[PDB]
Amino acid sequence: MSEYRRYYIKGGTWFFTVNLRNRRSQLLTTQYQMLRHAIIKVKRDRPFEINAWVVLPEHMHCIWTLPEGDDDFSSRWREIKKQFTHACGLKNIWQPRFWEHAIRNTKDYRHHVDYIYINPVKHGWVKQVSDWPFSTFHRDVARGLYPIDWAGDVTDFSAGERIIS
DNA sequence: GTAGGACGGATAAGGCGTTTACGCCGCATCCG
Ligand code: NI
């Protein structure tokens, strides 16, 4: 049984980790499109800012900032996993709920954005963060945020990742 | 501050039915 309490703060920024139940799945990748589509549908109905996001074949990590006066990432995640569950007609694919962490300062924010873009490399998919197309890294390189050839240390602070067994 | 199917009580999908424009019921997934 879990014990965490959602940290709700209006206008807040947070980091999240949502895992597919099945380790060998590649569904988030294969059906990249339905996923993309789902987040779009929900974003429209309950506005938020995607600070950053990666999708891996079987889980994703991301950072959101919610509108002023709005603390409700819960609904937003509930709808997202719902649309995508609907769209691909598969049942019980998600690890229930999700990992949430409130970002209170700029340093922490950057560690978590980096963590996001480094992730494909930590997970062994690619040797270079720009090799992975399934993220906002390229969106961010396309403003003057990150050099396309960016690299960074692979770190291990606890972050909602599935247990490595 | 903190997971890994707590599980009862919530929200409120979209497919049904007609009033082909909304109401009814109450998904799949949330929280404490
Ligand atoms: Ni990861």
mmCIF file of C-alpha atoms (C1' of nucleotides) and ligand atoms in Angstrom:
data_model
loop_
_atom_site.group_PDB
_atom_site.id
_atom_site.type_symbol
_atom_site.label_atom_id
_atom_site.label_comp_id
_atom_site.label_asym_id
_atom_site.label_seq_id
_atom_site.Cartn_x
_atom_site.Cartn_y
_atom_site.Cartn_z
ATOM 1 C CA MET A 1 0.000 0.000 0.000
ATOM 2 C CA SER A 2 1.230 3.646 -0.912
ATOM 3 C CA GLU A 3 1.528 6.651 1.445
ATOM 4 C CA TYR A 4 2.380 9.674 -0.628
ATOM 5 C CA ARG A 5 0.219 12.775 -0.643
ATOM 6 C CA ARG A 6 -0.220 14.773 -3.847
ATOM 7 C CA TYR A 7 1.510 18.074 -3.509
ATOM 8 C CA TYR A 8 -1.111 20.538 -4.796
ATOM 9 C CA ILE A 9 -0.191 24.132 -5.426
ATOM 10 C CA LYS A 10 -1.948 26.482 -7.786
ATOM 11 C CA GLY A 11 0.150 27.609 -10.776
ATOM 12 C CA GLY A 12 2.727 24.969 -9.856
ATOM 13 C CA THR A 13 5.314 23.136 -11.852
ATOM 14 C CA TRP A 14 5.913 19.411 -11.492
ATOM 15 C CA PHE A 15 7.837 16.419 -12.812
ATOM 16 C CA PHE A 16 6.009 13.147 -13.513
ATOM 17 C CA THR A 17 6.848 9.568 -14.494
ATOM 18 C CA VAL A 18 4.177 7.367 -16.014
ATOM 19 C CA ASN A 19 5.001 3.736 -16.683
ATOM 20 C CA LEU A 20 3.441 1.124 -18.834
ATOM 21 C CA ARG A 21 2.731 -2.015 -16.772
ATOM 22 C CA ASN A 22 4.666 -4.295 -19.236
ATOM 23 C CA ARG A 23 8.499 -3.961 -19.344
ATOM 24 C CA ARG A 24 8.865 -5.416 -22.879
ATOM 25 C CA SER A 25 6.125 -3.171 -24.369
ATOM 26 C CA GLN A 26 6.920 -0.686 -27.183
ATOM 27 C CA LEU A 27 3.456 0.582 -27.395
ATOM 28 C CA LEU A 28 4.227 4.240 -26.453
ATOM 29 C CA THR A 29 6.619 4.310 -29.330
ATOM 30 C CA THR A 30 4.795 2.210 -31.958
ATOM 31 C CA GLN A 31 1.609 4.186 -31.267
ATOM 32 C CA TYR A 32 3.439 7.434 -30.797
ATOM 33 C CA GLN A 33 0.643 9.075 -32.802
ATOM 34 C CA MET A 34 -2.311 8.043 -30.641
ATOM 35 C CA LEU A 35 -0.268 9.227 -27.667
ATOM 36 C CA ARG A 36 0.574 12.542 -29.230
ATOM 37 C CA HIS A 37 -3.092 12.789 -30.202
ATOM 38 C CA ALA A 38 -4.345 12.037 -26.656
ATOM 39 C CA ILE A 39 -2.199 14.674 -24.950
ATOM 40 C CA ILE A 40 -3.429 17.161 -27.558
ATOM 41 C CA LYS A 41 -7.126 16.398 -26.866
ATOM 42 C CA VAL A 42 -6.632 16.845 -23.097
ATOM 43 C CA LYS A 43 -4.350 19.876 -23.337
ATOM 44 C CA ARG A 44 -7.067 21.701 -25.303
ATOM 45 C CA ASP A 45 -9.765 20.989 -22.653
ATOM 46 C CA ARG A 46 -7.580 21.677 -19.599
ATOM 47 C CA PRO A 47 -4.750 23.996 -20.659
ATOM 48 C CA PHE A 48 -1.191 23.458 -19.399
ATOM 49 C CA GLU A 49 2.386 24.170 -20.457
ATOM 50 C CA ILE A 50 4.619 21.254 -21.442
ATOM 51 C CA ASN A 51 7.987 22.378 -20.056
ATOM 52 C CA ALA A 52 9.452 19.076 -21.222
ATOM 53 C CA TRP A 53 8.565 15.516 -22.128
ATOM 54 C CA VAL A 54 10.175 12.234 -23.237
ATOM 55 C CA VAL A 55 8.382 9.157 -24.402
ATOM 56 C CA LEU A 56 10.144 5.877 -24.141
ATOM 57 C CA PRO A 57 8.772 2.691 -25.625
ATOM 58 C CA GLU A 58 7.349 1.688 -22.230
ATOM 59 C CA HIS A 59 7.199 4.800 -19.951
ATOM 60 C CA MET A 60 7.530 8.529 -20.037
ATOM 61 C CA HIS A 61 8.751 11.381 -17.883
ATOM 62 C CA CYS A 62 7.648 14.971 -18.166
ATOM 63 C CA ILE A 63 7.362 18.500 -16.664
ATOM 64 C CA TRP A 64 4.156 20.631 -16.589
ATOM 65 C CA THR A 65 3.245 24.074 -15.392
ATOM 66 C CA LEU A 66 -0.395 24.676 -14.744
ATOM 67 C CA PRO A 67 -2.435 27.897 -15.307
ATOM 68 C CA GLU A 68 -2.745 30.449 -12.530
ATOM 69 C CA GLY A 69 -5.235 29.261 -9.886
ATOM 70 C CA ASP A 70 -5.117 25.663 -11.209
ATOM 71 C CA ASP A 71 -3.613 22.788 -9.150
ATOM 72 C CA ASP A 72 -5.269 19.852 -10.902
ATOM 73 C CA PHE A 73 -2.725 17.624 -12.628
ATOM 74 C CA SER A 74 -4.764 14.635 -11.408
ATOM 75 C CA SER A 75 -7.637 15.095 -13.836
ATOM 76 C CA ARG A 76 -5.246 15.899 -16.592
ATOM 77 C CA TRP A 77 -3.379 12.612 -16.166
ATOM 78 C CA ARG A 78 -6.579 10.743 -15.740
ATOM 79 C CA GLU A 79 -7.896 11.900 -19.043
ATOM 80 C CA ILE A 80 -4.591 11.358 -20.870
ATOM 81 C CA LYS A 81 -4.136 7.703 -19.889
ATOM 82 C CA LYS A 82 -7.837 7.330 -20.588
ATOM 83 C CA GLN A 83 -7.829 8.679 -24.189
ATOM 84 C CA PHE A 84 -4.811 6.633 -25.055
ATOM 85 C CA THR A 85 -6.262 3.499 -23.425
ATOM 86 C CA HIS A 86 -9.436 4.113 -25.500
ATOM 87 C CA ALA A 87 -7.641 4.858 -28.763
ATOM 88 C CA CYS A 88 -5.605 1.636 -28.822
ATOM 89 C CA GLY A 89 -8.451 -0.373 -27.292
ATOM 90 C CA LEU A 90 -6.061 -2.262 -24.980
ATOM 91 C CA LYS A 91 -7.026 -2.861 -21.342
ATOM 92 C CA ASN A 92 -5.044 -2.300 -18.145
ATOM 93 C CA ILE A 93 -1.795 -1.132 -19.765
ATOM 94 C CA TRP A 94 -0.799 1.599 -17.250
ATOM 95 C CA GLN A 95 1.074 1.366 -14.014
ATOM 96 C CA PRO A 96 -1.657 2.761 -11.750
ATOM 97 C CA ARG A 97 -1.400 6.430 -10.838
ATOM 98 C CA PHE A 98 2.040 8.044 -11.412
ATOM 99 C CA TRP A 99 5.055 9.642 -9.723
ATOM 100 C CA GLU A 100 4.793 13.381 -8.933
ATOM 101 C CA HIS A 101 7.379 15.810 -7.734
ATOM 102 C CA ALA A 102 6.952 19.520 -7.203
ATOM 103 C CA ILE A 103 9.700 21.774 -8.592
ATOM 104 C CA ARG A 104 10.286 24.716 -6.244
ATOM 105 C CA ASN A 105 13.461 26.371 -7.815
ATOM 106 C CA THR A 106 15.432 26.852 -11.043
ATOM 107 C CA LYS A 107 18.259 24.417 -10.314
ATOM 108 C CA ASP A 108 15.909 21.546 -9.589
ATOM 109 C CA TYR A 109 14.016 22.427 -12.761
ATOM 110 C CA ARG A 110 17.070 22.155 -14.953
ATOM 111 C CA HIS A 111 18.215 18.896 -13.277
ATOM 112 C CA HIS A 112 14.843 17.515 -14.123
ATOM 113 C CA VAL A 113 14.739 18.873 -17.696
ATOM 114 C CA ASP A 114 18.225 17.416 -18.304
ATOM 115 C CA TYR A 115 17.125 14.191 -16.676
ATOM 116 C CA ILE A 116 14.313 14.065 -19.118
ATOM 117 C CA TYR A 117 16.428 14.560 -22.253
ATOM 118 C CA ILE A 118 19.218 12.267 -20.988
ATOM 119 C CA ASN A 119 16.808 9.516 -20.202
ATOM 120 C CA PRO A 120 16.820 7.696 -23.576
ATOM 121 C CA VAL A 121 20.546 7.317 -22.976
ATOM 122 C CA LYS A 122 20.306 6.183 -19.362
ATOM 123 C CA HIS A 123 17.882 3.516 -20.537
ATOM 124 C CA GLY A 124 20.281 2.231 -23.220
ATOM 125 C CA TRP A 125 18.189 3.124 -26.250
ATOM 126 C CA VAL A 126 20.719 5.585 -27.738
ATOM 127 C CA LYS A 127 24.296 6.783 -27.199
ATOM 128 C CA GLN A 128 23.446 10.435 -27.935
ATOM 129 C CA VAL A 129 20.447 12.414 -26.731
ATOM 130 C CA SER A 130 19.826 13.867 -30.161
ATOM 131 C CA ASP A 131 19.452 10.351 -31.610
ATOM 132 C CA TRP A 132 16.082 10.043 -29.840
ATOM 133 C CA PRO A 133 13.200 11.618 -31.797
ATOM 134 C CA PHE A 134 10.534 10.903 -29.217
ATOM 135 C CA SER A 135 10.855 14.005 -27.062
ATOM 136 C CA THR A 136 10.682 17.781 -26.844
ATOM 137 C CA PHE A 137 14.491 17.957 -27.085
ATOM 138 C CA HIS A 138 14.297 18.978 -30.760
ATOM 139 C CA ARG A 139 11.461 21.399 -30.038
ATOM 140 C CA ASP A 140 13.880 22.935 -27.496
ATOM 141 C CA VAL A 141 16.950 22.904 -29.756
ATOM 142 C CA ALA A 142 14.731 24.719 -32.274
ATOM 143 C CA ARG A 143 14.540 27.589 -29.893
ATOM 144 C CA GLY A 144 17.925 28.478 -28.444
ATOM 145 C CA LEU A 145 17.572 26.274 -25.399
ATOM 146 C CA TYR A 146 19.874 23.329 -26.057
ATOM 147 C CA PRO A 147 22.729 22.691 -28.482
ATOM 148 C CA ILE A 148 21.704 19.792 -30.739
ATOM 149 C CA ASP A 149 24.963 18.053 -29.641
ATOM 150 C CA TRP A 150 24.201 18.397 -25.940
ATOM 151 C CA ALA A 151 25.371 15.726 -23.567
ATOM 152 C CA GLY A 152 25.105 15.430 -19.759
ATOM 153 C CA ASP A 153 25.872 13.134 -16.844
ATOM 154 C CA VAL A 154 23.477 10.172 -16.459
ATOM 155 C CA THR A 155 22.255 10.546 -12.803
ATOM 156 C CA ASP A 156 20.253 8.365 -10.362
ATOM 157 C CA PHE A 157 18.179 10.476 -7.932
ATOM 158 C CA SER A 158 14.894 8.639 -7.384
ATOM 159 C CA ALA A 159 12.415 9.710 -10.046
ATOM 160 C CA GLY A 160 9.586 7.185 -10.306
ATOM 161 C CA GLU A 161 11.456 4.725 -12.575
ATOM 162 C CA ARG A 162 10.374 1.065 -12.543
ATOM 163 C CA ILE A 163 12.404 -1.223 -10.254
ATOM 164 C CA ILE A 164 15.415 -2.662 -12.155
ATOM 165 C CA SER A 165 15.249 -6.414 -11.699
ATOM 166 C "C1'" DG B 1 6.987 14.690 1.073
ATOM 167 C "C1'" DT B 2 6.529 10.160 -1.819
ATOM 168 C "C1'" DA B 3 4.903 3.871 -6.104
ATOM 169 C "C1'" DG B 4 5.033 -0.337 -7.602
ATOM 170 C "C1'" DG B 5 -3.069 -3.584 -8.707
ATOM 171 C "C1'" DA B 6 -5.107 -0.635 -0.768
ATOM 172 C "C1'" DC B 7 -10.211 -0.033 -2.755
ATOM 173 C "C1'" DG B 8 -14.578 2.736 -1.583
ATOM 174 C "C1'" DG B 9 -16.122 6.859 -3.325
ATOM 175 C "C1'" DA B 10 -15.344 10.396 -6.500
ATOM 176 C "C1'" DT B 11 -15.038 12.657 -11.657
ATOM 177 C "C1'" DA B 12 -17.572 12.801 -15.830
ATOM 178 C "C1'" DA B 13 -15.573 9.543 -21.254
ATOM 179 C "C1'" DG B 14 -18.566 8.937 -25.451
ATOM 180 C "C1'" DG B 15 -22.230 5.689 -27.357
ATOM 181 C "C1'" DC B 16 -26.872 5.334 -26.501
ATOM 182 C "C1'" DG B 17 -31.240 7.327 -27.549
ATOM 183 C "C1'" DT B 18 -34.009 10.907 -29.629
ATOM 184 C "C1'" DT B 19 -35.844 15.940 -29.045
ATOM 185 C "C1'" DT B 20 -30.130 14.319 -34.740
ATOM 186 C "C1'" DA B 21 -28.869 18.687 -29.336
ATOM 187 C "C1'" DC B 22 -28.761 17.232 -25.208
ATOM 188 C "C1'" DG B 23 -29.920 14.152 -21.097
ATOM 189 C "C1'" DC B 24 -28.665 9.489 -19.069
ATOM 190 C "C1'" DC B 25 -25.398 6.518 -17.345
ATOM 191 C "C1'" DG B 26 -21.427 6.554 -15.289
ATOM 192 C "C1'" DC B 27 -15.804 4.561 -18.882
ATOM 193 C "C1'" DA B 28 -11.059 4.250 -16.999
ATOM 194 C "C1'" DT B 29 -8.448 6.297 -13.482
ATOM 195 C "C1'" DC B 30 -7.960 9.533 -9.741
ATOM 196 C "C1'" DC B 31 -7.134 10.303 -4.270
ATOM 197 C "C1'" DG B 32 -6.263 9.225 0.540
HETATM 198 NI NI NI C 1 13.054 6.701 -17.460
#
